[PDB]
Write a protein that binds this DNA or RNA. Structure first.
Ligand SMILES: [Zn+2]
Length: 99
RNA sequence: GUUAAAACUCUUCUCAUGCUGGAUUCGAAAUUAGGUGCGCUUCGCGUUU
């Protein structure tokens, strides 16, 4: 609308962290060095998915609260488009407000 | 057996020139490389005063 909420999130690891590498060429290049490479950018910086953990977190607690929420984790699921997690993170036609 | 018969309105000359299917609209919306696996096994801080 007229405003936009910018939430700057700084995350500090309180234990080891592993996000696995998704790129085929980076995994096949590292297969003789490490059997579980970490997802890194090509600027040599660690890249963690953030949308999808936020969505899973909100879906589990809003399902526990009893407020209406669909499951976008079940296989080939279709987001309902009416729940609040479909508003923030997206549905098939309305898209996520929370970029 | 027609004031007859006989004599091809013929030859030559490009519908050509000038004008852009252009304008408007994002392949992107939905999907966490996740799940499983204990740096463990072996070696007395001896000896020497
Ligand atoms: Zn929904």
């Amino acid at each position: 609308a007229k405003t936009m909420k910018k939430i700057y999130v700084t995350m500090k690891t309180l234990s080891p962290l592993y996000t696995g590498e998704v790129r085929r060429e980076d995994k096949e290049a590292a297969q003789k060095r490490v059997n579980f490479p970490v997802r890194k950018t090509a600027t040599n910086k660690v890249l963690i998915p953030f949308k999808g953990a936020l969505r899973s977190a909100l879906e589990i607690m809003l399902k526990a609260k009893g407020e209406n929420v669909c499951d976008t984790g079940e296989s080939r699921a279709r987001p309902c488009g009416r729940c609040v997690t479909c508003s923030l993170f997206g549905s098939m036609g309305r898209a996520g407000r929370a970029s």
